[PDB]
Amino acid sequence: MIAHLINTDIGNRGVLKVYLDYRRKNFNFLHNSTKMFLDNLERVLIVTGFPIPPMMVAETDGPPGALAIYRAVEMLGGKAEILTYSEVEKALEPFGVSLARTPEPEDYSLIISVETPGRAADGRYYSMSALEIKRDPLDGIFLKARALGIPTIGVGDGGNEIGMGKIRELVVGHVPHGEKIASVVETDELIVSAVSNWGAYGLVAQASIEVGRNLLEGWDERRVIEAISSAGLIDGVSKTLAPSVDGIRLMVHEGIVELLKAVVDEAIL
Amino acid sequence: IAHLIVLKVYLDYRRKNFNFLHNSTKMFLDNLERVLIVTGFPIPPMMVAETDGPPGALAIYRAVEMLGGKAEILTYSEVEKALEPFGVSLARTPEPEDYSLIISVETPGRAADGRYYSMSALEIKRDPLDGIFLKARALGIPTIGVGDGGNEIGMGKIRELVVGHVPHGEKIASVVETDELIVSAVSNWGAYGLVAQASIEVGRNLLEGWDERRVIEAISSAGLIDGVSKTLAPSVDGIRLMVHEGIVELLKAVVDEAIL
Ligand SMILES: [Mg+2]
Ligand SMILES: [Mg+2]
Ligand SMILES: [Mg+2]
Numbered sequence: 001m002i003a004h005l006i007n008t009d010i011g012n013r014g015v016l017k018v019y020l021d022y023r024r025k026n027f028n029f030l031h032n033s034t035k036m037f038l039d040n041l042e043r044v045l046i047v048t049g050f051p052i053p054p055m056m057v058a059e060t061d062g063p064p065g066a067l068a069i070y071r072a073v074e075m076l077g078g079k080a081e082i083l084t085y086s087e088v089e090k091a092l093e094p095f096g097v098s099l100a101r102t103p104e105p106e107d108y109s110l111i112i113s114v115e116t117p118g119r120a121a122d123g124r125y126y127s128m129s130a131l132e133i134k135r136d137p138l139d140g141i142f143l144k145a146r147a148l149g150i151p152t153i154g155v156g157d158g159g160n161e162i163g164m165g166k167i168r169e170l171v172v173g174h175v176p177h178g179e180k181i182a183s184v185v186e187t188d189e190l191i192v193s194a195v196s197n198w199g200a201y202g203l204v205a206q207a208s209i210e211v212g213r214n215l216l217e218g219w220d221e222r223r224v225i226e227a228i229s230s231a232g233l234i235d236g237v238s239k240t241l242a243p244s245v246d247g248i249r250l251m252v253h254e255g256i257v258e259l260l261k262a263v264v265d266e267a268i269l
Numbered sequence: 270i271a272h273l274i275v276l277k278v279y280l281d282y283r284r285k286n287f288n289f290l291h292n293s294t295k296m297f298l299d300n301l302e303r304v305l306i307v308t309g310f311p312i313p314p315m316m317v318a319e320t321d322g323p324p325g326a327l328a329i330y331r332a333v334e335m336l337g338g339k340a341e342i343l344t345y346s347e348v349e350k351a352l353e354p355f356g357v358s359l360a361r362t363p364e365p366e367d368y369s370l371i372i373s374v375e376t377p378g379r380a381a382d383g384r385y386y387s388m389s390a391l392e393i394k395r396d397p398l399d400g401i402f403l404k405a406r407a408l409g410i411p412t413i414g415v416g417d418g419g420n421e422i423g424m425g426k427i428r429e430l431v432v433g434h435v436p437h438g439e440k441i442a443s444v445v446e447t448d449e450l451i452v453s454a455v456s457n458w459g460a461y462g463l464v465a466q467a468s469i470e471v472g473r474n475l476l477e478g479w480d481e482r483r484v485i486e487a488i489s490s491a492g493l494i495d496g497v498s499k500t501l502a503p504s505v506d507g508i509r510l511m512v513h514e515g516i517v518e519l520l521k522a523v524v525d526e527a528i529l
C-alpha cells in the first residue's frame with residue numbers, strides 16, 4: 001500500500017499520529033486524490049516552495065515532488081506549469097519546466113500544492129517551529145480556486161501547508177504549536193505523508209497503478225536532490241546546503257522511491 | 270520502522286498501542302540468554318508450511334546470536350529441512366522454563382473453540398505448536414508474537430480488533446496471547462522490523478548482510494510454498510521478491526540513518 005509507505009516512521013510523532021487519525025476516517029485519501037488528479041489533466045498548476053526562517057530560503061522538500069508530478073502530467077498527455085519562488089525556479093531550470101506567469105485559477109483544470117505555506121488562524125504563515133515566515137505568499141490562488149470551485153489537491157507533511165486546513169483538528173491535537181501553526185487553507189483532496197516529496201511520489205505511484213504504466217520509472221532521486229541542493233535550495237532541518245531533505249539523507253529517500261517503483265511494477269503485472 | 274512494516278487491523282493497533290514495536294524490541298533485548306523462536310504456518314488443504322515466517326525467524330535467530338545470545342527453532346519438519354542450510358539449532362523436547370524468551374513468527378494460534386483456522390476459515394489440521402506459549406504465559410516467561418492476519422500466536426492480545434475487521438474473525442481470531450505483539454502486512458517484515466529496531470537501539474545494523482532473495486529461493490526450493498498461490502514460487506504472501514527486497518533495503522537505510 002502506497003499511502004502507508006509514504007508515511008513510514010520518520011521519528012516525527014506528529015505527522016505519524018496525524019496520519020493514523022486522518023486515515024482511520026479517510027482510508028482511501030490517496031486514491032481519492034488520484035481520481036481527481038486523473039480526471040483533470042488538461043492544464044495543471046503545481047505550487048511549491050517553503051521559505052525557512054530566519055533566511056526565508058526555499059528548501060529541498062516540495063520541489064522534487066512537484067517535478068515528479070509535472071513529469072507524470074506530461075506523460076499522461078496533459079500540460080503543466082509550476083508556481084514557486086525565484087531560487088526554486090533556478091533550481092528546476094535544468095529540467096526545462098514551464099513556469100507559470102500571471103496565473104489565474106480559472107486558466108487551469110487542477111491546482112496542486114506540494115509543501116507550500118498555508119495561512120494559520122491569525123492570517124500569518126509559520127514554520128514547524130513557530131517562526132513567522134516573511135515572504136510573499138502563494139496560497140492566495142487556492143482561496144480563489146476554492147471560491148471558483150476549481151479542483152484542488154494538497155500535499156503536506158507537517159500541518160502548516162496548503163490544504164492542511166481540512167484536518168486542522170488533527171494538527172492542533174498532535175503537532176507542537178499546532179494551534180498557532182496549523183494552516184486554515186482547505187483543499188478538495190488532501191495527501192498526508194512523512195516527507196512531502198514522498199506524498200508527491202505516492203500520487204504518481206497510485207496514478208501509475210490506475211493507468212497501468214509506471215510513471216515513476218526514470219526518476220532519479222539522487223540527481224534531482226543534488227541538482228536543487230547545488231542550485232542553493234537548503235535542507236529544512238539542518239538549514240544548510242546538504243544533499244538531503246527534512247534532515248534525512250538520500251539513502252532513505254532513494255529507498256522509498258525504489259520500493260514505490262517496485263510496488264507499482266508488481267501491481268501492473 | 271513500526272510503520273514501514275489487515276492494514277486496518279494494523280491501523281487500529283498502532284493507534285491503541287503506539288509503541289508496540291519499541292516495547293517488543295525492549296523485551297527482546299533484555300532476554301537474549303536463550304531464545305526459543307517458533308514458526309511454521311500450515312496451508313490448507315495440503316497443510317504444508319509457507320514462505321512467510323521462516324525467513325523472519327531466521328533473521329531474528331541471526332540477530333540473537335550476533336548480540337551474544339543463543340537461539341533455537343521449534344518448527345515443522347519441512348521448515349527444518351528448508352532452514353538446514355543455515356545451520357540452525359533445532360529445539361528438542363523444549364520446556365518453557367528453559368528459555369529467557371519465546372518468540373513466534375507467523376505460527377497458528379488456537380481459536381476460541383480450540384481449533385485452528387486459516388484466514389479463510391478452512392480448518393488447519395496438523396499438530397499444534399502454540400501450547401508452549403500458553404504455559405509460557407502461566408510461568409511468566411517473556412513472550413513476543415508476530416502475525417499478519419489475526420489467527421496467529423499472540424494475536425489474542427488484540428482479539429477485539431480482529432473480530433471487528435477480519436472476515437470470519439469471530440471463528441478464526443486466535444485466543445493465544447503474548448506479552449508483546451508485532452502486527453505487520455507480511456510477518457517476515459514484522460520480524461525484520463524487530464531486528465531493525467533492535468539495530469537502532471544497539472547502534473549496529475543487524476540486517477547488514479541479509480540477502481532476502483537468497484533466503485526465499487532457498488526455502489522455496491526446499492519445499493515451502495507461497496501461502497497465497499499454494500505453489501512452489503519464490504515469493505511470500507503472493508508478492509514477488511522485488512517488493513520484499515525493497516522493504517529490506519528500506520529498513521537497512523532507516524537503520525543507517527538512525528545509527529549515524
Ligand atoms: Mg517537510
Ligand atoms: Mg512541513
Ligand atoms: Mg496470516
Ligand SMILES: [Mg+2]
Pocket residue numbers: 321417454455456496506
Ligand atoms: Mg502472511
